[PDB]
Paper text:
These efforts led to the discovery of conformationally locked benzamide-type derivatives that replicate the interactions of the natural CRBN degron, exhibit enhanced chemical stability, and display a favorable selectivity profile in terms of neosubstrate recruitment.
In addition, 11d and 11e could contribute to IMHBs. Fortunately, we could study all compounds generated in this iterative step through cocrystal structures in complex with the hTBD homolog MsCI4.44 These data confirmed that the preferred orientation of the ortho substituent toward the amide NH was preserved in the bound state of all ligands except for 11b. Sub van der Waals distances ranging from 1.3 to 2.0 Å were seen in 8d, 11a, 11c, 11d, 11e, and 11f. Hit compound 11e had to be excluded from further development due to the formation of reactive oxygen species (ROS) in the presence of the reducing agent tris(2-carboxyethyl)phosphine (TCEP). Subsequently, the aqueous stability was determined spectrophotometrically by following the changes in the absorption spectra of the compounds at pH 7.0, 8.0, and 9.0. Encouragingly, even compounds with CRBN binding affinity similar to lenalidomide, such as 11d and 11e, did not trigger substantial degradation of SALL4.
Residue numbers in the entry:
A (entry chain B): 19 to 123
B (entry chain A): 18 to 123
C (entry chain C): 19 to 38, 44 to 123
Write the structure that this text describes.
Amino acid sequence: ASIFRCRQCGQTISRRDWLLPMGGDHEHVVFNPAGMIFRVWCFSLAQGLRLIGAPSGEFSWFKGYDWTIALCGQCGSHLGWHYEGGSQPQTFFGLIKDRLAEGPA
Amino acid sequence: GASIFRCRQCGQTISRRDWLLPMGGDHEHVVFNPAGMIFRVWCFSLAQGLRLIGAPSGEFSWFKGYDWTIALCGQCGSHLGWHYEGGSQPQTFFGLIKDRLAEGPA
Amino acid sequence: ASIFRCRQCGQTISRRDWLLHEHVVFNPAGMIFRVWCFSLAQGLRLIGAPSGEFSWFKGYDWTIALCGQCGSHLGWHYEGGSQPQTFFGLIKDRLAEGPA
Ligand SMILES: Nc1ccc(C(=O)N[C@H]2CCC(=O)NC2=O)c(O)c1
Ligand SMILES: Nc1ccc(C(=O)N[C@H]2CCC(=O)NC2=O)c(O)c1
Ligand SMILES: Nc1ccc(C(=O)N[C@H]2CCC(=O)NC2=O)c(O)c1
Ligand SMILES: [Zn+2]
Ligand SMILES: [Zn+2]
Ligand SMILES: [Zn+2]
């Protein structure tokens, strides 16, 4: 019964029902090669994003997946990444919890 | 990809996914202390970059036959978990609080 | 590790004094669970009708036991057997352990 919206503009992005426990947990704290730290929640599906660039396997936080940057398709806020090319699931999203706002449908 | 664990507060090198240790079946144990704080602890055979403070205590030990010392990040002082000693097979290991770490490339 | 609580929300469920300790069992899909059996428990909500399907414990039917505080599935209540008539089989990995 709860949806996650872009914190910057309010667009609906994903749903609590779509939380996915990748490696056992839906929440992963991660750091990128530039040493930036993010708190990522995994969701099976999303809507309202815009994925940019071609998929890349380098430094993927999730083994067996390629990633693309995900922006809010409405306002352009960087909300996380889409992952593809694996199995069970084939694809999923890692969204930056602090850039979403959770709320009632 | 996601092979090294760092302190989430400051980036200090702490451990590695390769060093995770399944104690009693699982590397993950969820526990609470006398103050009712719940922790999701990951067991590691090895860790670095910590500062172990105090002398070991067996009081309230979550792990049978081990005494604990508090493990802080050696750089920033954040409480990252506990070192366990005095036990058997293994004698020693680390229990680190998963959400106080950040996972990332080597 | 004398009190057992819901790992998701902390609701008190049972205690080492009530234990009967791990049983390793597989569901029909061959997934591993570590079950602890307790003679007593509290703070659950038992839902639905008893079922004998794939019961791990010969002689007993099960009902689903949820955490009464947050609704997380913590295990099952077993009934209809003998010595004892009833008990709770809770999933070790869904519980948090700590002091009294
Ligand atoms: N110079 C940079 C800056 C940033 C990144 C960056 O954020 N990468 C992410 C992409 C998603 C992922 O799973 N893992 C990462 O490490 C990167 O790969 C190179
Ligand atoms: N007043 C307090 C507050 C907290 C603790 C505390 O976190 N103890 C931990 C230490 C590690 C352990 O295995 N078990 C615990 O229960 C404590 O022992 C006393
Ligand atoms: N979609 C399902 C259906 C059933 C189970 C499952 O764990 N069944 C248990 C019920 C208790 C028991 O004694 N034996 C079992 O095999 C499950 O894990 C998923
Ligand atoms: Zn937006
Ligand atoms: Zn630190
Ligand atoms: Zn609960």
